[PDB]
Design a protein around this ligand. Structure first.
Ligand SMILES: Cc1ncc(C[n+]2c([C@H](C)O)sc(CCOP(=O)(O)OP(=O)(O)O)c2C)c(N)n1
Ligand SMILES: Cc1ncc(C[n+]2c([C@H](C)O)sc(CCOP(=O)(O)OP(=O)(O)O)c2C)c(N)n1
Ligand SMILES: [Ca+2]
Ligand SMILES: [Ca+2]
Ligand SMILES: [Mg+2]
Ligand SMILES: [Mg+2]
Lengths: 803, 812
């Protein structure tokens, strides 16, 4: 009886190593008491039969790694029971899905050339599997299923899952393998319907994974679900799932209050190959899905030649996700019938795999034959299924044949005061930390008396948008408090730890009615790639939301370079996909080293093309306030890249008056206040210094010290698109200028000079011919490691500018 | 009856760690909420079985091992953890105490002497010093050669003084970059007669980015010692010791990517010892906002690594677990993870009052005495040391505190031809046909082998063979050549065949490996290491960079599938490759091969982003090239391997140009030439072309030369000359000036490129060329694709119209 308990556990824990999951059976070595009629606390023979049928057939179940005992028991109870065999109607429906999938693959490989790399041949069982996921989500009465996938079988998914007509898919035939889509799934045997959408993606495998999560979360927030009535269905390749780090980063978001989507259904199209590379060179684990153990997700390894087991596992996966709001991974073992592309004979690199693959008949033929052998379908019914295949193959050829034949951002002072007062409108019994208390009181003072600092200006911009009814999502590393202890968007009760969000009071009107707005502010995980991916995705999911991601320091945003390059900077031109995502990048030379100095302005300026992004480096709190309000209210979906301050947050010269918020607008170009408001004479100016950011204050302090009336400092607040007209009109007001200099803190090969030094004399030749540069010398790093070297270099720039 | 006992044993083994007293702060208040003999074959009283299970799984060590698929590994851990362990000797306890004394004294000095050092404080986590000491001592006990450490900034200088053994005079000299520099030392056993080398690798502030770099460096050192995967012995005598933070370990994707390399034939280092300094905080962020798993180390389950969660206030358990981790790694050549639960005594940096965001954690922390005082007190309670001995431990603490204050005070008072012979070419050609007895060549690979023998003897050498001629000749000269990347053995474009596969057995054959043996039969000292990489960019590039640091005499090449995917490794490019030399004095000779070219395959199969590498470049940091001929690529690789200078090389390599019949080279280009940074048209250097007829000069780089040359030939345009810039960085100023001076009647000059106006070489050349050579490039104009937000159009129809528009503009 003790040997039985240890045997039951052996099947539950390790039974999946004996499971018949590989349709190619490449591993020969894989499968290599007599008192069975004795009753145990059920007869041993009946215990072993249940254990073999549940754990050693076409499904390999991995679940004993799960720490929650209720989750282990849930799987156990559903897997260790005598399952009701599918009805002939359900079997015929699965067969019709295989018929449609294989007829689409036959057409693709016959009608067009160069389509072999998109081939789903050897993996057509993923179509009835995805169909069962979506149908089971419809059965749960859910609202939408959003899909992210690589290029393999994407057009088959468009036709047989999303339900896109052939006329739309094969219109002016590629970019079609990277575009988004929307459709409606209607249940076959049920009375429910569900929305099905496919998100756009680059060729960069797995990069879309966090983008899907953000998009689904934005949709869930709009529907007020999380319920979690919007389901992410994420498809993968076996080599990419095990090798791409973004997979682990996206899994790590699955249960976070700021990023959870109530569980993702993962489908790995495990064709046991990655171009020419064997699994043994692609991963250090038994399974390509072993990374999912990181969050204790249940994993089901299923034989891709058994579409009934695949459909059953898909439905069980949806039920688990609904019950525990956690990720489920389906590892579908299949094969890639043809080579990776046109110039590939896969027996050059994988002779053994492809000698076995050459003897394989399709999943459709195998399933049709297995249904005859089992006596589930008659010869007429098998013949009718073959008619259905031919008819489906004819329809796509025929339908395609017919296709071929044919605003003010200023707020009222009462708005500033309301946001100010909100910082003191504390809940009953709330204990503020003694060091947070002066920050709340100073904000009430600033709101009524002026000298508004950068940190408060940001909250005035965000707070006024929430008051106007906008959803504001703000996140990043330690973003609630702020890296530089300046934000305090969330304050923590000194005795209970209860969080209080002052800006959330602006979601309610003075009369007590909701504005429709909301403030969602989170501390992110220590991720850049997945967090930026998520935020980009969130802005796509809800175009009406104000979405801001904040880097700890701009220097760490290179960890999210694939998102910047493949989605943010180029998604609009490539896919017509629009994003209003904001990236806040703390930037500035202060002597803290090459990883706490630059958000790499030069790289964002290099990526920029007409109307793709807005790139700014504001120097005043009011200009930042108007930049965020213009972004949220301009009705245009364009990413905004902001180079934000660090020490300039506390510079007492970098403060703004209430009138700058109430009676002004965003200024792309800024002159010195002595010329616009003071008694300064523009006609005395012979040298013009053009700059951006905090170095203005150091240049202005030096000018004041030596009383240099012959020098003027002009700031370019909007770096991209270049404010050509505002720039020209500003410089025209200084007629006696004999020399012009672009002054920057960044090395010569960095900052704005590489692009401005080439663009400014071309766009404005009567103004910038002969433009010279004052900067740090060109460097292989964003700065020196020494704060002593930094300090000498900073002084050398100021001395050169006034020499 | 005994079924409730078998179920109890399994429950403690599987889930005991969930009840183990691992948190020294005890923040979770919900966490912790007989005399009959049983068969276990041995007969033990139920009380004795339960006491063994409680001590093993529910004390100060939480053991996670039942997830391991190998039964022998599960049994090994079980046998060592479920035994009545011999308590450490008073001498061993006093030695652990002396390590805590030294660690805490270093920390107290660091906060008192200098300002702005709070962010690198190890207070609340000093137990990592006797833990690291036990790792290194246990590696010395196994007679290993070296322990190579990678870590973030927290406790770095303490590790330098108390682990690496660097003197204070060296540590606080010209006192920051010191928290990022590499170091080397010798660890000498206290209680033994063994010694071991201890080194610390350089790293940026980018947490976890150094993880694959450490692996690459260790692997290079193992290959040099002929230990491990490419060695005669299975000792893997160089041990990676990788330190982490709890928030970074769970959130950074490079962790999973590096763990995925642990057992790969091309990347394994025989197991890494991981130490997570789990201070249960990440700046102001709580674990519940940093991970979706019970533990920060749950990612390590991915490779079935054993995980030990240990209480940082128990340095005995920490030392014991460290020694067990080294023994497991030696027995199974697999990763071990130590999750050391501790706390961060101070705020994250100066000014930070941590009770603002974590009031509860920091009210508990304020009541906590140090790990040192805790261990001194716990030894008194156990009766292991007397009151006098406890007072001497406090005097050893004061003496250590005085020594560092005094030592630093005293410090302040005092302060080649690349051409080969035709016989070399022929030998590499013949090697492609020198097949092992019984080997079956796939019928489609056989002509490639026969064509390479014909190329070596008769010329018209293509790009793919030229690469193997450079690599093969270096191996023949005694150089180690490491080449890897996605499908690099065969080649993405089916052009390489560095490894060929037996049609019947699947056995691999490497033709270039025959060149590691001289014609007499003696070894050359060279070797060819060629691998297919995992589907990773960040970890694979990190690894290859690290490998070139570990063996500066090796030729290390990493090949991107397409240059477009190298942005996945941007942190390595930015933080190590382009800038490691200027920041840390750390040198790398790593080569990046990036398939590049506009051919209508879309924005992710077109560009390796030349403009970004050119933007990163600064005098003497990297070499950036886009060769147009096979012989020039051959001489570029040979120059790089033989220059005696450690500097990264970035090569933009071809795709369709691999099979362009005009892009072939003669034997004389390999045997009687050198690398040419600037190339003229052969009609001027070898033909009957007249340079004086030229009025328009087109400056270009790469495959567009052939299209421009074909158009010139078609219209017989004697008035137009095409000059190629093969070396993009550093700009070949002298060669470029001398070349253009040979065309006196030139009235207009154009930089012609395939890439959009905001991409390619134009953003830097358009600004630098008129400045570096004003008498030659004043008035230089651009012919290119329009500026774009992506590297190209998604349409091959649009690409084709744009390609023709460039050629027509160049000859209009
Ligand atoms: C991040 C990134 N790095 C590399 C590539 C290049 N790349 C591809 C092409 C050439 O673009 S396909 C491919 C192998 C895919 O292996 P898998 O996951 O087993 O799938 P499959 O069997 O369904 O194909 C790679 C490696 C990429 N797309 N993205
Ligand atoms: C990749 C990347 N993204 C962000 C940062 C910024 N950054 C740091 C500074 C300000 O640069 S420290 C830090 C928190 C570290 O948390 P941990 O791992 O729990 O450790 P600890 O408790 O031992 O400190 C972060 C998040 C970084 N360095 N690298
Ligand atoms: Ca907008
Ligand atoms: Ca070199
Ligand atoms: Mg695959
Ligand atoms: Mg930490």
């Amino acid at each position: 009886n003790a040997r039985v308990i240890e045997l039951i556990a052996a099947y539950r824990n390790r039974g999946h190593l004996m499971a018949d999951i590989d349709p190619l059976r490449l591993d020969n070595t894989r499968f290599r008491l007599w008192d069975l009629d004795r009753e145990f606390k059920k007869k041993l023979r009946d215990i072993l039969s249940v254990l073999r049928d549940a754990y050693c057939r076409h499904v390999g179940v991995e679940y004993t790694h799960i720490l929650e005992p209720e989750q282990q028991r849930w799987i156990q109870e559903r897997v260790e029971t005598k399952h009701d065999k599918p009805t002939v109607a359900e079997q015929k429906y699965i067969l019709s899905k295989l018929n449609a999938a294989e007829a689409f693959e036959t057409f693709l490989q016959t009608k067009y050339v160069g389509q072999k790399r998109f081939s789903l041949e050897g993996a057509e069982t993923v179509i009835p599997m995805m169909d069962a996921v979506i149908d089971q989500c419809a059965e749960h009465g859910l609202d939408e299923v959003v899909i992210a996938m690589p290029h393999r079988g994407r057009l088959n998914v468009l036709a047989n899952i999303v339900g896109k007509p052939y006329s739309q898919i094969f219109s002016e035939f590629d970019v079609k393998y990277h575009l988004g889509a929307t459709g409606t799934y209607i249940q076959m045997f049920g009375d429910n319907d569900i929305e099905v959408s496919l998100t756009a993606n680059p060729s960069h495998l797995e990069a879309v994974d966090p983008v899907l999560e953000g998009l689904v979360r934005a949709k869930q927030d709009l529907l007020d679900t999380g319920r979690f009535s919007v389901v992410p269905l994420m498809l993968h390749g076996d080599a990419a799932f095990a090798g791409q780090g973004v997979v682990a980063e996206t899994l790590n978001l699955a249960l976070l209050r700021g990023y959870r989507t109530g569980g993702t259904i993962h489908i790995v199209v495990n064709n046991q190959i990655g171009f020419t590379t064997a699994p043994t060179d692609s991963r250090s684990s038994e399974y390509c899905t072993d990374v999912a153990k990181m969050i204790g997700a249940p994993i089901f390894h299923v034989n891709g030649d058994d579409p009934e087991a695949c459909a059953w596992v898909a439905r069980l996966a949806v039920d688990f996700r609904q019950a525990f709001k956690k990720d489920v991974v389906i590892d579908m073992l299949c094969y890639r019938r043809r080579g990776h592309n046109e110039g590939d004979d896969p027996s050059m690199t994988q002779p053994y795999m492809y000698d076995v693959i050459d003897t394989k008949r399709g999943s459709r033929k195998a399933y049709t034959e297995a249904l005859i052998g089992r006596g589930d379908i008659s010869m007429k019914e098998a013949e009718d299924a073959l008619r259905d295949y031919q008819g489906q193959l004819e329809r796509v050829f025929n339908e395609v044949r017919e296709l071929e034949k044919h605003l003010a951002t200023a707020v009222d002072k009462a708005m500033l005061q309301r946001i100010g007062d909100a910082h003191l409108a504390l809940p009953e019994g709330f204990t503020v930390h003694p060091r947070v208390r002066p920050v709340l009181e100073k904000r009430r003072e600033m709101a009524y008396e002026g000298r508004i600092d950068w940190a408060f200006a940001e909250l005035l911009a965000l707070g006024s948008l929430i008051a106007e009814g906008k959803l504001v999502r703000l996140s990043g590393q330690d973003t609630q408090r702020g890296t530089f202890t300046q934000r305090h968007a969330v304050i923590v009760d000194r005795k209970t730890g209860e969080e209080f969000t002052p800006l959330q009071l602006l979601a309610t009107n003075p009369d007590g009615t909701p504005t429709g707005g909301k403030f969602l502010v989170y501390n992110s995980a220590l991720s850049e790639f997945a967090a930026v991916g998520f935020e980009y995705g969130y802005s796509v999911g809800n175009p009406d939301a104000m979405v801001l991601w904040e880097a700890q320091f701009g220097d760490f945003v290179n960890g999210a370079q694939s998102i910047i390059d493949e989605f943010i900077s180029s998604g609009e031109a490539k896919w017509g996909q629009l994003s209003d995502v904001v990236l806040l990048l703390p930037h500035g030379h202060e002597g803290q080293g090459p990883d706490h100095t630059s958000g790499r302005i030069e790289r964002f300026l290099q990526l920029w093309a007409e109307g793709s992004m807005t790139i700014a480096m504001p120097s005043t709190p009011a200009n930042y306030f108007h930049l965020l309000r213009r972004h949220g209210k301009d009705g245009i979906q364009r990413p905004l890249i902001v180079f934000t301050p660090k020490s300039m947050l506390r510079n007492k010269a970098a403060v703004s008056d209430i009138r700058d918020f109430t009676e002004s607008k965003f200024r792309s170009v800024l002159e010195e206040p002595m010329y616009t408001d003071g008694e300064g004479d523009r006609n005395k100016v012979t040298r013009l210094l053009l700059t951006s950011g905090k170095i203005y204050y150091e240049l202005a302090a030096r000018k004041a010290k030596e009383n240099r009336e012959d020098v003027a400092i002009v700031r370019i607040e909007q770096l991209a698109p270049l404010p050509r007209r505002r720039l020209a009109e500003t410089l025209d007001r200084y007629p006696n200028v004999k020399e012009k200099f672009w002054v920057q803190e960044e090395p010569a090969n960095q900052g704005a000079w590489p692009s401005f030094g080439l663009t400014l004399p071309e766009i404005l030749p009567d103004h910038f011919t002969g433009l010279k540069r004052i900067s740090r010398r060109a460097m292989s790093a964003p700065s020196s490691g020494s704060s002593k070297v930094h300090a000498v270099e900073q002084q050398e720039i100021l001395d050169t500018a006034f020499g």
